[PDB]
Symmetry: C3
Subunit: 321 residues, 3 copies
Amino acid sequence: LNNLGVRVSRLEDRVGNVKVTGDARIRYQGSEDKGVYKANSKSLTDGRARVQFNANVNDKTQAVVRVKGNYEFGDSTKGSQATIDRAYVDHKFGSNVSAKAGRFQQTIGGGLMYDDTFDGAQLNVGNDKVQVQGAYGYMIDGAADGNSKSDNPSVSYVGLKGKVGKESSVGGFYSRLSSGNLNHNGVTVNSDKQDVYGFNADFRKNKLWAGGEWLKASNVDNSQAWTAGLGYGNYDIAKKGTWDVKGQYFNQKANAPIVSSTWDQAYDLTNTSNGYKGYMASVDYAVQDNVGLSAGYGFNSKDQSGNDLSDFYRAELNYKF
Amino acid sequence: LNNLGVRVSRLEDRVGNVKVTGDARIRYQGSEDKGVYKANSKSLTDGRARVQFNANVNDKTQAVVRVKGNYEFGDSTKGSQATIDRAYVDHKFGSNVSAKAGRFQQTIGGGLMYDDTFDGAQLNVGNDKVQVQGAYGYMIDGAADGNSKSDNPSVSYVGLKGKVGKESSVGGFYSRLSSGNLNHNGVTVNSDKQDVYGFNADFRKNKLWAGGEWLKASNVDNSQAWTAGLGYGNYDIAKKGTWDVKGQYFNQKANAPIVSSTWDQAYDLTNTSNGYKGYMASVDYAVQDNVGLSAGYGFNSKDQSGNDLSDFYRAELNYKF
Amino acid sequence: LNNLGVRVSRLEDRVGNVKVTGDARIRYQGSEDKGVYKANSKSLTDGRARVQFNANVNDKTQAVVRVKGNYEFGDSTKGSQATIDRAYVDHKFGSNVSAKAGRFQQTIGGGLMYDDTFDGAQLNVGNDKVQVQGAYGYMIDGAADGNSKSDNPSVSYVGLKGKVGKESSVGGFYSRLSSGNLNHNGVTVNSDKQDVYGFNADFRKNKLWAGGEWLKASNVDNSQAWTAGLGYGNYDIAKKGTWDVKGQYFNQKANAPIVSSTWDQAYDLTNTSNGYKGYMASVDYAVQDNVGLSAGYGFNSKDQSGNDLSDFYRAELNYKF
């Protein structure tokens, strides 16, 4: 028993404050019309490998550094360059107040508008039912990609979230964006300030999910965007046999601010100049522990004027380390 | 005893599923003529640092992510880029069948044609006496570098390996390459379908080794290539004092497909227009545990028409950690 | 207990020779005149994340591989590319002789002339009170950035460091630079050989600190550069509540070689065409364990001819993993 203890103690020397996690993904995307996912083609098979380091700076602060690498199956034009996707420090100023600083992931509202990289600061105040999240910074991925410091609109976001029921939650959000460059239909246009505001709901009872979100720019005409979805399943990547099915509908207008949505819709501000309106059915199945298989079929895609867009379909495998 | 276990649990809370290995290399290469290794010069001293993360997704699957960085001693034009060299998932479908998916390392035959990065899928059926390996994908390195997905020649490879006696192994392979752009003597030229079939043998007894390989494209004339080598030693980088010496003759014709050979000759389809034929003597010595000094000298280098080529020589330090 | 013993051994299987450390910095720099820190702007808010893998090749050798990623808050033109900052091997040939090989950090003398990346070899002979350091290689960062191998000036450095008390140490250094391209005021000018020689001294009685450094090129005229500073504090980033204040003065002539100094003056060989002469006050405070807030204000900046220069000021937060 004593010797074993010593053999434990030596391990305590080698292990540090950094825990290494990560994930891998092999994805296939396709559409009935060329150009939706890859230029001058109607298919795209790619892969991604992310390695994350969670470091315990001390007992009240932690940092996260994520290194990602994307590649296409057969694309040898350039090497799979490694990029720092996440680099931020998280502080716990008590049992309620929390803070984040650096390049982290921000979700503007319910994720329909933005659920991706964010350069700036974030604050969180709330115990168990009411949570106020306040972020200040700049968007990175999505239609806000390719902009410089002077040309990148600054987001001031405040979001209220309330826990109604056991695992159901409602909420709202109010964001203000300064004038800056945004990617509309493949061209960078300098847009004025916007006052986006929105509401969302997510009711989940015993393997039945019903979610919805509606956002609108206060000072921009025909700029609202909403989504509504239902689903059944108990998906969890860490347990075998856990599946999930869901069907949702997206109706977003021409001027609706959709930089990089959380959902796997193929049409957003970057792709469409006259809105998007259509359904999408997604299926997930944990084939093994920490190995999940996802499929998705987006159909009935149309513009806001009835013009018929192109369908799309995805199939991906995600491995969690 | 309960406390000790708690300690172990804390270690299991921090160690995770990712094991970090890696290696480093300090290499010098030279030749008697300019342009063999570095443009407009006859020497190249460089270094490489690779860090590999091996993650146990579950009992029957693991993933590998390798971050590689090359640099040249004194070259400060660009920072040492970090590139995702390997990113793949390995599945064990029982005691015999195994599968690989993603960006891995493929060895087409004995390694003379290609032993390097590969984007696609691999399926191994093993019996500890006879092994079958089938790969479908794209070459990423060597003469296949600089190609897009629409120009990269797809490879469909099937290889058999028979373990004759103990530690000795023979084998063969048949591969089909689709039409695509290949780098012939620095010029990207489009080539039609090719059928590369070959055999190899590797007889190791006591401390002596004798190997050979022969491959040929069925529908292309003047594409036959082969190598034959003899060596003596017991090299193992993790064991100090283990040495090794070998001498091998390479004879590859003008149109022989040699994308990225597993050996260290400096002439493979990318810097030759009329073939290669010559000897190469290599020496290895584990100076310390996990440290190895390798040297090589390639001489009698000639084209297939009798015209002389440039001799070359290498000296490298490999640190394994 | 046998069940526990199997677990602990498993940990030793999943814990290799690589220990992962790192740091994360969030920095703000600014000046009263545009262009000191960023083009056409008098401010720069950036962040950096470094992850270092310290390996143990064996009991007498150890390698280091550092992956560094910089970004600017709001700059989305390019991803935060990961660069291999350090990649080298450290050998320990007894209790008095040590060596390094690869891309490491070199401090030429006291660091006023250069303390940054270095490609080459280093040898150390130390009597535990008198140390001799000899480095042969190339500069990679600072005014030597953007140079190829054929243009990078080779550096042959021999430095001596003696201890004259409990903490106070004096020393000197002699370095030889070959002909090469160096960045003077944004223009890459070719310069002949230089024979830099210099001295430095440091005294750390109690918490007081008094440091100084002088250096000059033997053949070039108007190349003398010196710094002298005082301070009081016990700054240790791993201890909460440890503060530090200091104030120093720099006097750098027009042709004084300041490639990448170890101090934080905003003016060096890359920014100054007629030298620099001014004061700088720095403050450090470890607000938390492994967290530190640093501030700096450089004022009275002037050319060697009396022409006024801009005043600079910075504030940063450093977290050690």
